[PDB]
Amino acid sequence: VRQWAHGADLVVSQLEAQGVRQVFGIPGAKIDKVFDSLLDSSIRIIPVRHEANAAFMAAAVGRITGKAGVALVTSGPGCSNLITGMATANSEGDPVVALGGAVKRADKAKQVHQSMDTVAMFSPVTKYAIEVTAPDALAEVVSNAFRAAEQGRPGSAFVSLPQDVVDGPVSGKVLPAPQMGAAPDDAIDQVAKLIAQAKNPIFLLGLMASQPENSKALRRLLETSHIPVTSTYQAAGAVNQDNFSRFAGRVGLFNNQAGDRLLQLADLVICIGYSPVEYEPAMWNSGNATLVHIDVLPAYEERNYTPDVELVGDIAGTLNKLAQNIDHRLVLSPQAAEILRDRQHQRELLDRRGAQLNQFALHPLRIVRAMQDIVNSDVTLTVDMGSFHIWIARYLYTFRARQVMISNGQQTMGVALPWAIGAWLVNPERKVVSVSGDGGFLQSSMELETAVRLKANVLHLIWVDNGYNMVAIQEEKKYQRLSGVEFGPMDFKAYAESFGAKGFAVESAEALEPTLRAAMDVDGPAVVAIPVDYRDNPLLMGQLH
Amino acid sequence: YPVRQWAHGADLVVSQLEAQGVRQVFGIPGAKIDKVFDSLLDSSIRIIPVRHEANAAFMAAAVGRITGKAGVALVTSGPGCSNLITGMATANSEGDPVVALGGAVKRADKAKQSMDTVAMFSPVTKYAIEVTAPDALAEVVSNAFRAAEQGRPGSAFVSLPQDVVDGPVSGKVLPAPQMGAAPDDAIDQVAKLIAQAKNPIFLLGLMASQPENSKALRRLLETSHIPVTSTYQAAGAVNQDNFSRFAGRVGLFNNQAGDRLLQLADLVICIGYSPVEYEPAMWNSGNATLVHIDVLPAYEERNYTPDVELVGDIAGTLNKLAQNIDHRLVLSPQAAEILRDRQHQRELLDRAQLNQFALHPLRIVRAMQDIVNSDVTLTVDMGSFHIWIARYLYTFRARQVMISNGQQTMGVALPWAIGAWLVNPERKVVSVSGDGGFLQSSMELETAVRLKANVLHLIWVDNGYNMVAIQEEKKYQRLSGVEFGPMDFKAYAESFGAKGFAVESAEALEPTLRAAMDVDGPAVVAIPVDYRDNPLLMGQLH
Amino acid sequence: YPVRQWAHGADLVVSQLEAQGVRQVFGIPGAKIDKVFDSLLDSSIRIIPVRHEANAAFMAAAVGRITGKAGVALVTSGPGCSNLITGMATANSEGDPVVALGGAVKRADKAKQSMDTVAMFSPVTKYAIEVTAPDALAEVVSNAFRAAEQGRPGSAFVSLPQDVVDGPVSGKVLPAPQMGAAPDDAIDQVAKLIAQAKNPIFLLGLMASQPENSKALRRLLETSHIPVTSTYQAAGAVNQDNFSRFAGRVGLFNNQAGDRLLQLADLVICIGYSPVEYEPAMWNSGNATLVHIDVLPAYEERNYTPDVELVGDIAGTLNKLAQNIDHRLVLSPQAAEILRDRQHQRELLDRAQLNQFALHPLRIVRAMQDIVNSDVTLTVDMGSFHIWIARYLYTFRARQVMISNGQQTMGVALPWAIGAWLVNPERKVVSVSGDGGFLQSSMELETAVRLKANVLHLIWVDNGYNMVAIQEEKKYQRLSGVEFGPMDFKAYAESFGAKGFAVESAEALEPTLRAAMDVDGPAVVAIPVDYRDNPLLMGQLH
């Protein structure tokens, strides 16, 4: 152990030990010693314009690297401004460690309830929430926060750091930054035998199946077996139409997915890193099939989810072993092949690569096609929440992006831009495309200054309707009249340029592709406003569950 | 197990309990939860009414600790639930799987001008939920058992709103884990470290004392002959007789061979151990290769940051580790000396004619060891007597001992004993406590008599709270609030219909214990004790 | 009271208690909180060790209810605190001012691998705080008493970390409200409504039973002669003898004159009343002018939305209201009939030779009324006997009765009685309970004997949980978990050193009660009861 002048120095040293490359946040009196200590480290300080976005950026870093993104904020409002961010990350399973300042331990303002009980506030939306009361257990708590966020089913962790603890001296050491084995060999063999006997098997991918550490094993198992696959949105990016011929689409939103039909037909369903909370089991489990559960944790038994076999342990190890016990590729049953044949037909019908679509404001389909043109395998795509989100999800089979951040169970708006910046920081050599509506854009657009400051190569697309359309179409369907969903117009090109970023505003369908192309080629942050005609939304909504 | 339409959610609950292998339920009925007690009447599940809910949690814990399956407590709303709190916290601390089903007001009256029980139980449980979705009643219960029984066992609380249990519901009962050993690659990495170790030592924790790990543990020890020491949560895992290289229990006394071996160690392998069981600072000097083996990743601490972590099925890991141990260990000079000292230490601790009255603690311990045989379960309450018994655990040869008690909750012994007896009603159980601990749960004597439980409860009588008195004496040289009046425990026990005895002389001690042990049913023996020599034992504590 | 340097925070605490007028403290010592018990030794404050912490909260509540000043409980960390929960919740529900001082681990070990007691107590208290600022120790305590004693009294919890009470602190003891009557203008507005009322009625709540409001209440009733009815929290505020227009207690029975008058009312004036005391839906038809008088604004409900609210000092308001009442009330035809019916009702309820054995409830009530005189405090536990006693409260003439119990917590009687006796040790106290309630707190008999408390505890013996059994019978026509074994309560009581009695025939009832009452000290009488006629009484409940 060492004698540390400040607890902040030990915290920073622990962060370095955790492999943290940067920290997102906003400084304040209570937490400033930590920002100060970061000056003497290898960790880059990234100042944001609103704490909420610090949590969103950290979440993106977590989902991509698999290692926790870090947010650093001051006490009081500093911490409360992160709450929505922490809840969103926790919901989508993104590892995030938030370090929040607090008044000194003995501050009498605590007894008079003059200072926020942040631990109580964060406990409901985090996997781990705690306040350091013992200076000597500083590295310990920070270390445990990372383990709690990155292990098991990933989530967010909050650590409250009293000012006196980080400012005062401490004596401790840096704790170096798991070793869980695959499922039992007998159970794996058991499953390999169920597979060899199944006529209509199918894989249902969940959150844990999309983790980076399981990518290789998953790819190997799919290639060896050639068994159909369907995914929940928390695994939307694990597999796509283009990289697997037997992909059946993502389930949980549209009522005609091949994944749902195959699951109904299945005589053997193998869930990977799946939890019933990702998609209602009653929606696909007919009970007429043998059920296998593969994950880092036991299954949450439920009326429509009582696994016949449960393989708990290291997912990658379990999938690799299973792959080694497969003698041949699956020969699709006439029925299964028919269902895949139908998805092929529906994609054909959803497509329109030859239609004019030159109306203005732009038709959602014309915008989706233009987005597909610029989003390729070297481009990451982040998607906000709103009506355009449903359009993009319907066509996820057409996006050939390196990766896509779209899952958003809490339906939190404003995540796209912050997600893109975080995704960009993980791979600054690649391009990132973020997309939102005007509502979401204005909730985090302040981070545009952050983007310009970082020279972040992010292209943000704004679908403009001058209102909260996703809520409006719900009100129209229920009351046939609108309330609180309409607002005024804005000059987004000028809005963007006022930050020093490149701004564009589509004034006709013909200008769409050229504009997106020029915006993509811009070396640095750019924003493109796209007026949209949401009149056809009812047609798309008719495909929802 | 098909999806059915149930006349009362209470019926689904009961079927779910039967599916979990529940044989009995402990508790006290009330208006809000009465439909469940009524449903149990058509069940194969036995209803065991207690006299105080706290004891339902204690009895359920013993059941859980012994069977591996959650003990079940059932109480009504309000005070029925709040009376379980201490019991639930005690089970959670000792890792005993318990599921408490607590009644509550109908959902609609919750915000009406009822206790927020979930909020009160959340701090002392692993799982605390309230059923708000009638159609997910079987799920919440089922998953409560999962929470209590899996990983590091603990207590689970489920609030059942009256309208949910009395009203009809649809649903199916859910059937009552398959994890493998640690990564073989890592098991070799550890096996290699063992071959390079000069002073290897095993530190056993809670999970190491689980029956599912028995065979593999013994197999690993018989093949390596590496010395062993245990926390009190694994007090029963290994004893002096079956392992000559046993180094005792660590955490209480400052002169244990286990601690000396830990300090001397170059390689320490912890199994089913968690810091909470014994302050790492107390034994981890910091310059030894630390290996962690458990069902859960290590809960890192300042002085407990393992170099290697083997997470997974313990029995599987240990079995694989054993197969990778070529030669048995040859104790180093210091190691051998340390173990030799423990032997000399035992000879000393054992070595006179203590015929004074009130009885000398050593005399009582000696007599206790005589009646406690390998077929008997011994339960120990909290108090000064606890220290005396702990000091001599090496010479106790009981089927099992329930002594671990981190919260230091008094009153646990009798209810634990009743719970343990119900698991194996053909055997005898012996519980011991002080007068203070005795009156906190003695109301269960009626329950013991009602059940015809073959339990013998011993009471060390000093007429006070001695364990507290000695700490006050040491710190203030005067006493406060630790002295109370005397009682005739013989008549007290007889009033319940149990057999009572009161030792009135030293020579009467042994004969009285025998007459009590020979009683087929509940019996209590009050034993006046002279705690004057406690200072000499306390000097042996950390 | 100057700012001093204290050797131990524990010393400041004690001085603060003395400043609050605390005469005794109830509790059980422990390592974390022992310095406080030690500090009390140099205090004028008496240390009263209990046998179970829950009872410390019950005894403290009686003290608070009677003196108006918070009763004090002192316990150690962990189970010491969790054992107080039910007691604290019961006090908070009945409005009894109680301050619990609970020990805790040193501040630095809190987040270390200790119970989050504040979080557990917050749901059942008015004030739950933990001292994190050593220099504000006297403040947190002082303000805990303020929280318990002011507004609507309730319980308050204070967690004292061991390092804070053992370590030195600086600070001064803080001296131990001045609110005026409601706005005179509004008092007239109400006085006007009273002059226009044809069927005015007073509904008394908790605050109306406070001694500080006695004189003003009587003065207001003697001047207006307006009929009165009371919730059970104000059961003692007024009785049949002192007010011929008393309409009984409302909330339990479906045939009360009070409810009929409330329904008939055109003007209802509630004093110190809060909906929680009696469901407004049960009596507020909704077409009467509703006036609310209390120390706190009305806690609006669906059927309790007062037209006029007089917030402020109750005694002052009532005194001013009285001075604005010219003529006494002339009962309307219906009002007079209703009161006449209550008179005929009493004549009936009173009207035979019940010499059966086991004893008939009516016989027991009759005998109870004979021994309970105007100098005796009567405490009543929860169970079927409770209903029987409530039915006949009009014929009980005790100094005071502790019966209100919204949580329906069993075991309250004896500890309450001990607490009430300590307030007036020269008087006799009588507590009554069922066998179930008796065993939950009977351990305090040792405390009673130790104190030489002049308490007589009566036990209605049925060998079960009857109040629950009758509800099961009605709903399921069968019983579950409500039957237990018999006991010899005579020997049980004697074992403690108290006087025990067991009624073995009807004719022996009265003589046995007398012999017990004549005992100068603790005495217990077990009374076998035949609950067969309970269905006839239950038909009288809402």
Ligand SMILES: Cc1ncc(C[n+]2csc(CCOP(=O)(O)OP(=O)(O)O)c2C)c(N)n1
């Ligand atoms: C923070 C927050 N508040 C409210 C909502 C509810 N809601 C869901 S998406 C959305 C916004 C729709 O506006 P926009 O982002 O402009 O997208 P559009 O549907 O209009 O394309 C709203 C208001 C939300 N998701 N997040």
Ligand SMILES: Cc1ncc(C[n+]2csc(CCOP(=O)(O)OP(=O)(O)O)c2C)c(N)n1
């Ligand atoms: C519920 C509870 N309250 C307070 C304590 C603190 N304390 C620890 S052991 C004990 C009791 C000692 O009395 P007894 O059981 O008579 O044993 P002795 O040490 O006197 O033999 C007390 C008061 C506790 N453990 N549990």
Ligand SMILES: Cc1ncc(C[n+]2csc(CCOP(=O)(O)OP(=O)(O)O)c2C)c(N)n1
């Ligand atoms: C702590 C607690 N648990 C459960 C209840 C529910 N219930 C209400 S009164 C009562 C007991 C009745 O037993 P007893 O005291 O013997 O009275 P009886 O009605 O039989 O005369 C019970 C079990 C309660 N009030 N308090």
Ligand SMILES: [Mg+2]
């Ligand atoms: Mg919009």
Ligand SMILES: [Mg+2]
């Ligand atoms: Mg004792």
Ligand SMILES: [Mg+2]
């Ligand atoms: Mg009874």
